[PDB]
Design a protein around this ligand. Structure first.
Ligand SMILES: CCCCCCCCCCCCCCCCCC(=O)OC[C@H](COP(=O)([O-])OCC(O)COP(=O)([O-])OC[C@@H](COC(=O)CCCCCCCCCCCCCCCCC)OC(=O)CCCCCCCCCCCCCCCCC)OC(=O)CCCCCCCCCCCCCCCCC
Ligand SMILES: CCCCCCCCCCCCCCCCCC(=O)OC[C@H](COP(=O)([O-])OCC[N+](C)(C)C)OC(=O)CCCCCCCCCCCCCCCCC
Ligand SMILES: CCCCCCCCCCCCCCCCCC(=O)OC[C@H](COP(=O)(O)OCCN)OC(=O)CCCCCCCCCCCCCCCCC
Ligand SMILES: CCCCCCCCCCCCCCCCCC(=O)OC[C@H](COP(=O)(O)OCCN)OC(=O)CCCCCCCCCCCCCCCCC
Ligand code: HEM
Ligand code: HEM
Lengths: 51, 446, 101, 380, 89
């Protein structure tokens, strides 16, 4: 995959890192919320009252 | 050799003086044997109050039909006698009366311009003849589709303000205005502090200043009732006007957002953004190898007949957007691709396209400032809008300070999640309505 | 050398597209570069190529091959599509390099 | 005007898909097989529907209902054995359809290939739970074994297996939900087959030469109409001789005993179409690694379009990769044989070498062979 | 019948087509068939024998097909041969 090895593609990747990281944060928060994961929701203060 | 920097700094400076009336007198000297001398007045359709909506246009028609000192065509006989060219134009904010002549005919030309600004005899028979002329030229101007589309865009973008109304005005006002309305408009909006005498080419500044002292001194300087007009900001409205007429062969669509204005420097950055998108029409020889992605996809998919980008600026407002001409069955696709390019400039601007846009803007500015007429035009607009003539070195500095990060920041400030004004004319059924365009004004992936 | 050339003729006979009358460049899979090079062909070579392809499809349809005197011999297998393919490949690399920088 | 076949909106879909569809003239009998699959799918559904008219998904009466179908329902033995041997025939036709797609370079139709891989996963899951349904000894113990390999997944596997079980082991809830899922999945398989045909008719179909067959194309009707009817009739000959003459040569005898959780069989196997995957999983001496080996075996079957490094499409003019392909098919036969054998000498080392050679042939040897062929044909 | 009557009477107009018809008539039939005989043979034709003759020469017959030009959408001989009969009849 040597097509995308250049300064323009590196600049595009660097520009799209924070949006992808924010979407990964969205996915992780949604996964923890939907599965009701005890490894994280036991640490958030207001969520502790339902356990 | 000399690089771009000292070639720009070797341009002669525009020297500005001021008379006792407040009339600005600005000139720039070159080695040409010809010259362009014009008068720029801060008076357009924005200063009209819907009862005199065609006063500037109709005065622009009447201004060459004779004065008190030079009655009738003898006046234009004089501007034939030296072989000079006489032009005038009116916009929504500025009016210009300019003469291209030789250098040695510099005094009489200035004297001629003096008559045109303060001695115009408005004969009633000439008023009727120019009324019929204005009616027939509106009857040919509505055949030109892009003027109709840009007037529709101005109307729907500046609803309820004096910036919606056209320069020509409605036809009822053309049938209605008399000589006294023209006299009141002439005594209200032709004030000496709102006037610039601009000269470009083979002119001496001291001789031009002496001629302005001789002829252009004591124009009015006084509003005669202590009733000074004030410029009022215009409300922008995200809206849509759709003039459907299916018998036309081609459709013209303009989409714009609110511009920053004359004095806001990020205009320069926005100009670079326009240079990334560029212009296209069907006679361009580039083929599929055009650098603009919109032009390349238009050639590849046979979508548009033409498109262009505009940054129209008025006093702290403006319209920034794109106008395209295409057949009906392509319209929606064109809109989609156009919006994608805007969002790419809001999200994924790279350094190479920014460098290309900066080079295109440098070429555009220097190639536009060529000849005595566009230099005089730039001097008049610069003294009316900025209050000073911005030199090309300052433009080059403001261009070279633009990088990709501030370009996508300013583009996100002005394009992303903004309500546009849409004006369509022709077979525009497949032109999407306001929800689809408004949803295309942002991306769900940012 | 000569042994490699003889083994390459033996592999050419073992490949079996000469038994259908096909050339070497007829058997190329139509990628984007191959379709562009086919579109750049002159009309005589284009018509010859598609008649050869149609005849090969007909022979495969009836599960037969050509007579041995009508087989495409090794030394008359002219690479007609190869310079057009090199032109298309080189200009695609140029466009890729320009988009890369 | 009166060309209803191409103006009626319902009839133009059947026309465009089966009558005026431009098909290559030179496609062999291998191209019959996918059509057979659709017909076989219909057969399964029809037999299953009649098998659903007398079967109860209760652990105290599932075996009793199967015996009541085979003994008291008029021609119920015929319907049951047509269903079982039609599952076997479906997997035979799947294997030959996939082998045609691998040999003739048909995986370059990437969307059709991926929808096929999803279809293959759905059919394997459907056949597994359908084999659990008669509630014999081998059904219960195969379900227990396969769910334990699912429980090999770390940190979520055990809770997922007790969620799928509906309890502590394979029980009443597992059998009833397996009946529900075994009913509902073939209709999703039919919808995915509609998507399969949609993508293929979007891209057109391939020919054994791998060339552009646009110069010589024929209507589907009546040529491939009568050719696929001949193929359906041959397939029904083989299916009905398998039903009426050798009904138990593919099944297992220990499924004719009722399910006993106290008694375990001496050797536990799945059916023959899962035996190569069982041998692939069983060769690696780890649980999670074996489950990943099975999943990645079907996933490298999905990954096959990214490994094509040849300028020719089909293997008709590629003899070295032909040899490698037939070695791969031979290796799959060896893995199917090993999957039905218990773990003694030398079956462990034979299955280990078979799985290693399988992954090495698919992942390494075929693109290297294609590069060597491109060198030998003087392409570059 | 009216079209055929008008066609043959309009064709026999002028010396050249009459001499042409005389030459073909004595070469083919051995005699010149009078035009009243043609009118009698036309007027003896009704719908029943037209159906019979059209079924004898047209229905379920193998045609000869010639095509020249962009004839890719010209159907197969099997499709044309199937179109030379009706399943509803
Ligand atoms: C010595 C060996 C026999 C030699 C011999 O008879 O040669 C004659 C003849 C030689 O063929 P050819 O003239 O060289 O070319 C073949 C024809 O052009 C076209 O013939 P074809 O073979 O392509 O016919 C279409 C094809 C169509 O094939 C299908 O429809 C079968 C599709 C696959 C069904 C698979 C079912 C499930 C399998 C599970 C395992 O049919 C077959 O492959 C066999 C048809 C048998 C019909 C019943 C005969 C009794 O042999 C055959 O046609 C083969 C079938 C013979 C029976
Ligand atoms: C049913 C009600 C919602 C319908 C969809 C909708 O309006 O979405 C809002 C919008 C689209 O509607 P919109 O057109 O109002 O979007 C406006 C978007 N901004 C504000 C950025 C300009 O959808 C989203 O923004 C995404 C919604 C899903 C978010 C991710 C999942 C959250 C839960 C994770 C577990
Ligand atoms: C099968 C037995 C052998 C059949 C046979 O004779 O195959 C030879 C045939 C040659 O075909 P070809 O190379 O196109 O030459 C035509 C020129 N006369 O070649 C072929 O017919 C090749 C196509 C055979 C496809 C079926 C064989 C493989 C079946 C198992 C595939 C398993 C795939 C993976 C599944 C799990 C994942
Ligand atoms: C050299 C010629 C053949 C031998 C001498 C005989 C000459 C006869 C001459 C008369 C004409 C016969 C007909 C010719 C028809 C077309 C040509 C042909 O069939 O060629 C032979 C064939 C392919 O040869 P080709 O692919 O061109 O060789 C590549 C080498 N560079 O096939 C071969 O070359 C042989 C391939 C043998 C492959 C053996 C594989 C063994 C291993 C299988 C393992 C399977 C199980 C794996 C399990 C793993 C886990 C335990
Ligand atoms: C929606 C349609 C289907 C229904 C309603 C259905 C229903 C049933 C029923 C009730 C049984 C239990 C009776 C028996 O044991 O023979 C069964 C068994 C089975 N089904 Fe299906 N089935 C369907 C489709 C399929 C498909 C598509 C396959 C895969 C090809 C399949 C594979 C099997 C297998 C392997 C068995 C076990 C046969 C045995 O051991 O007796 N079924 N099915
Ligand atoms: C559920 C069972 C399946 C059905 C009913 C089915 C149906 C069909 C049909 C009707 C065709 C067109 C006729 C033909 O060329 O044979 C076809 C072709 C095809 N199928 Fe499937 N298919 C199935 C499984 C698969 C699988 C598992 C794959 C992927 C490995 C696959 C990939 C393809 C490909 C690539 C073609 C194109 C053949 C070519 O043009 O060479 N199919 N299928």
């Amino acid at each position: 995959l040597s097509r995308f090895l250049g300064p323009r593609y590196r600049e595009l990747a660097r520009n799209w890192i924070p949006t992808a990281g924010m979407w990964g944060t969205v996915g992780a928060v949604g996964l923890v919320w939907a599965t009701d994961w005890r490894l994280i929701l036991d640490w958030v203060p207001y969520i502790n009252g339902k356990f | 050799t000399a690089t771009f920097a000292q070639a720009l700094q070797s341009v002669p400076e525009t020297q500005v003086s001021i008379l006792d009336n407040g009339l600005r007198v600005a000139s720039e000297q070159s080695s040409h044997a010809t010259c362009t001398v014009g008068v720029w007045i801060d008076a357009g359709s924005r200063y009209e109050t819907e009862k005199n909506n065609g006063a500037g246009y109709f005065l622009e028609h009447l201004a060459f039909k004779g004065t008190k000192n030079r009655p009738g065509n003898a006046l234009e006989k004089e501007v034939e006698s030296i072989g000079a060219h006489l032009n005038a134009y009116s916009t929504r904010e500025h009016t210009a009366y300019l003469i291209k002549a030789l250098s040695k005919d510099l005094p009489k030309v200035v004297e001629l311009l003096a008559d045109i600004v303060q001695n115009s005899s408005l004969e009633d028979s000439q008023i009727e003849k120019e009324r019929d002329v204005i009616l027939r030229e509106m009857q040919e101007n509505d055949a030109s589709m892009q003027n109709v589309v840009f007037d529709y865009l101005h109307a729907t973008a500046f609803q309820g303000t004096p910036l919606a109304q056209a320069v020509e005005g409605p036809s009822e006002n053309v049938r209605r205005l008399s000589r006294t309305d023209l006299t009141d408009y002439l005594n209200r909006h032709y004030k000496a502090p709102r006037m610039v005498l601009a000269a470009a080419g083979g002119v001496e500044h001291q001789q031009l200043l002496d001629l302005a002292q001789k002829h252009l001194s004591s124009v009015s300087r006084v509003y005669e009732e202590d009733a000074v007009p004030g410029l009022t900001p215009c409300r922008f409205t995200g809206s849509e006007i759709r003039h459907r007429d299916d018998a036309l062969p081609l459709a013209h669509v303009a989409i714009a957002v609110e511009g920053p204005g004359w004095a806001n420097p990020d205009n320069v950055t926005l100009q670079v953004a326009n240079a990334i998108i560029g212009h296209y029409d069907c006679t361009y020889g580039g083929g599929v190898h055009l650098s603009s992605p919109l032009a390349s996809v238009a050639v590849a998919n046979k979508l548009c007949q033409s498109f262009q980008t505009f940054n129209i600026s008025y006093s702290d407002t403006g319209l920034l957007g794109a106008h395209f001409v295409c057949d009906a069955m392509s319209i929606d696709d064109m809109v989609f691709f156009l919006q994608g390019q805007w969002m790419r400039l809001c999200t994924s601007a790279t350094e190479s396209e920014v460098t290309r846009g900066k080079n295109i803007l440098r070429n555009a500015l220097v190639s536009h400032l060529d000849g005595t007429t566009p230099v005089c035009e730039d001097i008049g607009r610069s003294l009316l809008t900025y209050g000073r003539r911005i030199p090309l070195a300052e433009w080059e500095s403001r261009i070279q300070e633009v990088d990709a990060q501030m370009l996508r920041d300013i583009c996100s400030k002005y394009f992303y999640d903004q309500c546009p004004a849409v004006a369509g004319y022709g077979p525009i059924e497949q032109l999407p309505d306001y929800n689809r365009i408004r949803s295309g004004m942002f991306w769900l992936r940012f | 050398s000569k042994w490699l050339d003889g083994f390459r003729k033996w592999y050419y006979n073992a490949a079996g597209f000469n038994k259908l009358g096909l050339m070497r460049d007829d058997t190329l899979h139509e990628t984007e570069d191959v379709k562009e090079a086919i579109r750049r062909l002159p009309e005589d070579l284009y018509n010859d190529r598609m008649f050869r392809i149609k005849r090969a499809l007909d022979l495969t349809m009836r599960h037969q091959i050509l007579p041995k005197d009508q087989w495409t011999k090794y030394e008359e297998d002219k690479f007609y599509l190869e310079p057009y393919l090199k032109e298309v490949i080189r200009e695609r690399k140029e466009r890729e390099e320009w988009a890369k920088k | 005007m009166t060309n209803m076949r191409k103006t009626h909106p319902l009839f133009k879909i059947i026309n465009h898909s089966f009558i005026d569809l431009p098909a290559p003239s030179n496609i062999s009998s291998w191209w019959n097989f996918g059509s057979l699959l659709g017909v076989c799918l219909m057969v399964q559904i029809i037999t299953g529907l009649f098998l659903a008219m007398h079967y109860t998904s209760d652990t105290m009466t599932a075996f009793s209902s199967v015996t009541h179908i085979c003994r008291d329902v008029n021609y119920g033995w015929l319907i049951r054995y047509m269903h079982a041997n039609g599952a076997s025939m479906f997997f035979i036709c799947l294997f030959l359809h996939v082998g045609r797609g691998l040999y003739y370079g048909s995986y370059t139709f990437m969307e059709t290939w991926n929808i096929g891989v999803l279809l293959l996963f759905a059919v394997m899951a459907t056949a597994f739970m359908g084999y659990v349904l008669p509630w014999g000894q081998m059904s219960f113990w195969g379900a227990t074994v396969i769910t334990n390999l699912l429980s090999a997944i770390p940190y979520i596997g055990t809770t997922l297996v007790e969620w799928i079980w509906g309890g502590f082991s394979v029980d009443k809830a597992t059998l009833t939900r397996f009946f529900a899922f075994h009913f509902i999945l073939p209709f999703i398989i039919a919808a995915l087959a509609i998507v399969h045909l949609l993508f293929l008719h979007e891209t057109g179909s391939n020919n054994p030469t791998g060339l552009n067959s646009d110069a010589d194309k024929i209507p589907f009707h009546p040529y491939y109409t009568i050719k696929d009817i001949l193929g359906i009739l041959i397939m029904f000959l083989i299916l009905m001789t398998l039903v009426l003459f050798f009904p138990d040569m593919l099944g297992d005898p220990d499924n004719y005993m009722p399910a006993n959780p106290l008694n375990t069989p001496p050797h536990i196997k799945p059916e023959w179409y899962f035996l190569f995957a069982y041998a692939i999983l069983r060769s690696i001496p780890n649980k999670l690694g074996g489950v990943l080996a099975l999943i990645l075996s079907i996933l490298i079957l999905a990954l096959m379009p990214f490994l094509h490094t040849s300028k020719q499409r089909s293997l008709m003019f590629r003899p070295i990769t032909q040899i490698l392909y037939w070695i791969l098919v031979a290796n799959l036969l060896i893995l199917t044989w090993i999957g039905g054998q218990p773990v003694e000498h030398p079956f462990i080392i034979i299955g280990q070498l078979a799985s290693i050679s399988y992954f090495s042939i698919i992942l390494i040897l075929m693109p290297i062979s294609g590069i060597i062929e491109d060198k030998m044909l003087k392409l570059y």
